[PDB]
Symmetry: C6
Subunit: 219 residues, 6 copies
């Protein structure tokens, strides 16, 4: 990653063993549960494209997902190249060349180049641009791997309402519902998919009930 030293410089630092192991272990333990993605983002704080590639290449399983992710990266790289074409001439001696999409993805750029871009005044933030592409790809993977439609999350007859709500919102998160839909669902599908005893209570409450008020009402 790129860090600041005591002279007030952003400098390169090697990726740590603790970071490397943390990422490998959360993929092994959680696969593509939605919470793996904010974990990835946080573990890759300050990452260069080289570091992001390291993290993704250290994953042993899930090679269908990794191939899909490469396809998404290649799509975003091709859109970058449409928006930001580069000169096809020799580099000005000593000077900084403009990144192509494959330079952002770290496949055609060196670490030294990446450091040069990221520590330019002002930064050409290749690590943050690449991370955005990766996260777009990982969100597609999370949705693909989501096992259950929200339509199929219904409260059991003896299931605590809290347990059902947990299953409902875990499914909405994996299915990639917007925050707008999550906030709105409280007055609609959440009640519909409730068991008859709870449904009666929630129907009786009237409109505008907070989730807290619905959860208190059904115990």
């Amino acid at each position: 990653p790129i860090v600041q030293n005591l002279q007030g410089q952003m400098v390169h630092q090697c990726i740590s063993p603790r970071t490397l192991n943390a990422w490998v272990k959360v993929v092994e333990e959680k696969a593509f549960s939605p919470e793996v993605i904010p974990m990835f983002s946080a573990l890759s704080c300050g990452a260069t494209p080289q570091d992001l590639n390291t993290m993704l290449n250290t994953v042993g399983g899930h090679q269908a997902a990794m191939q899909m992710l490469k396809e998404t990266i290649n799509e975003e790289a091709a859109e970058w190249d449409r928006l930001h074409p580069v000169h096809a001439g020799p580099i000005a001696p000593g000077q900084m060349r403009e990144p192509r999409g494959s330079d952002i993805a770290g496949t055609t750029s060196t670490l030294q180049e990446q450091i040069g871009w990221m520590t330019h005044n002002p930064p050409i933030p290749v690590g943050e641009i690449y991370k955005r592409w990766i996260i777009l790809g990982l969100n597609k993977i999370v949705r693909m791997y989501s096992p259950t439609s929200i339509l199929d999350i219904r409260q059991g007859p003896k299931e605590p309402f809290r347990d059902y709500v947990d299953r409902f919102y875990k499914t909405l998160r994996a299915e990639q519902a917007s925050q707008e839909v999550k906030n709105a669902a409280t007055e609609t599908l959440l009640v519909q998919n409730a068991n008859p005893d709870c449904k009666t209570i929630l129907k009786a409450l009237g409109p505008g009930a907070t989730l807290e008020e619905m959860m208190t009402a059904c115990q």
Copy 2:
């Protein structure tokens, strides 16, 4: 988080893998036991709003609680916006814009903006303001999840008085009794809910007994 370097500057530092894992693991192990909240506060020392969001987004389960927490945050953000409306014009070039409630919550502000606010002279402490909102929400969750009323904590016939007191005060803490009530309960409900043999001894002690004196009296 924001830290001080050797030039006497508060600087940004990436959230550590140890911090990330510590938080995920205490939620997995303790859920919304009351002691998880001071743990959250301590693990989030110096946090930016981005860091606070990372910590909350890394939680995989408990999605009913996480949705309730988002509702509480949105309430406090709307109260901030009532108290501190911002100008709806273009930013003065190079200058610092005033935060709205969604900027404090990190959903409409960048990390660079958050750093600017938190390291202004004097600080606009967006991380501490947001943390206060989060803790308000988490305390509501702890009370919701508290399984047992204090009325239902009564000493068993062969239960050591110490074990009963432990159960009593654990329940009072989850039910969110004030320190005033915790301090006062020693002369009242604690004795009432004691077993007959202890109740006799504690009744005999007279008023003003310290909890230490009650615990010594009943063994």
Copy 3:
């Protein structure tokens, strides 16, 4: 805690995840065995009152003990307020107010105030004063929780003398015997509570025997 940086300043540093976890884990594993107290003292090196509260609030069990500890803290705070009353007027602008007992205990003081006191020239050592109150309370807890009187530690007929001595001194430590009594007990209760075969040997040794000499004599 408060630490020294490279400009020779004592600065605030966040409590570490390793410190937080170490304390929670020693309470879970050892409860109020006497050795938990020097552990607390060492883990809280440099602590502010805020840090001390964090450590105590992160404890999930043992809520009878935690309530007793709050009572002891409130006693010592009331004695501080008797000895060191503060002015009941507006603060001199920009200047440092004198701490009350609840400021020392971190309930009515901010972190910034605590830093101001602890880094004043010369320090008003609020963290060390509060730690002294806490340790006084924890020692009361250790004595309360000590399961066995020294009178009841007697060597078994086939118990190795070393094993008995270990049980004797572990009990003396939890019962909070002074070092004077620990040093003196070697010539008296330790021998009396020995089994007949050892008692004969130790009686034969004469007075002034070191514990080493008694332990060698009985094997």
Copy 4:
């Protein structure tokens, strides 16, 4: 490894216990699965040739592979010596001698020499040159140890298409297919090796389907 200190110098630092243990443990757990190689590269960031030798020499098993790796290193060293012959005379006093292939591999060079080369202006990057040789050797080992031809990865009759794709791409990676072949295989061998029910669906899709589109189609 070589790191930068606060005077802006790249300095030597000892290899850490965490790095040493991380490498030993990933070889013990993963052997020569393909993902062990990007792990090696990342754990050896900034390594001197001495550090690279340490890492390889700390491996206890897999001595057939380690002997093969020595053979590959000796081949690349002999090619370096063909391209970059050195003077066979006495060193200019105080001056830096040119590295031979065995100096790059750390067998005939001292640590001080390696530091001199790597911190020259501009660097003679002996650690990076040697790491390239090692990685070439490790990739040969990964291919040798790959257990299964791609021809033999075929979807079972009740095997989820995702599980099959995972097995297909894991095998392609170990067999060291180019990214070109991985990207192209989606329209050809992947479909051929699918079960009849999926094969029908994928045949029906038409050409140019993304892997995401094929995986969605077959569930």
Copy 5:
């Protein structure tokens, strides 16, 4: 402990959680096996008397040994006081008082005093003096706890000579044989206590055989 900072000063640093836990865990796992003592010495590098007391007070078991250790410390303190009596008058204002034996042992001295002594030019090395007393006491404990006389270590009829030698030298170490005796024992008790078949071979070797030569001879 006392450490050097970047201004070239030895400064106080808090004892780490890793150090605290390392010591507690080696006593739990090894008790007073001889190798616990060099571990203690290394974990207490740079320790103040306060730190040494912390380490010893964090031990929960082994209270017979801890009482014996206090007795040894009190003996060495009384010898220090015989050799180095201090003035029984008021301290020169602002000036450094001379340590008594109980000041070296940290029972009558403050941390600030200990820092003053240890960072004086030249140091009054109270931590190293106290550590020497502690190690003298711990060596007495190791000998007391040694279970077996060297006379009773004899090679079994089917015991590999190496296994016997290991048992012999482990016992010599716990019994606190000098290095002179360890070096000499190879020509004498080691052979005598060997089984008849080995004894014959070692007798046949002649005098002056290295332990390596004896171990090779008997397999």
Copy 6:
């Protein structure tokens, strides 16, 4: 160990708990497998003679080996004293005395002396000299403890050739074959000790086959 600080000084630093535990644990887990030796060398990077003694003294088992190692150290110390005799007069006041072999081994030298030698301009590298003696001794131990002659490593009838090669080269390493012999053995004993089916294939290959080519040929 000795490290460089920010003023560009090599300074003493305490041995870490992680280093101490790493060494104890690799001896417990691997005993004198050959890979323990490069581990020792790497864990002792920058070590003083005091640190090297700490590491060796922290080993609890294997006391036959530790006594053999002391004998080897004493041999190398006596050779140093033959080559580098020292003056038998009083030290020049304030000046640096020349090390004897027992000073290099840390038995007759203080830490301060060792620091003085190792940080002299130019260094008298006592830690590196002593480490060389220790490694010479440890290599003798590894050979002594090697359980099996290379003559006795022969491929089983159903043993994969790779598994056999692994056993062959693990044995050659413990028996301390030179790299020359390891490289040459591929054309000779490795083939001879192969099973008949592999032997036929390897015989058919002709001379000069790489180990990779032999391993591919036999599967």
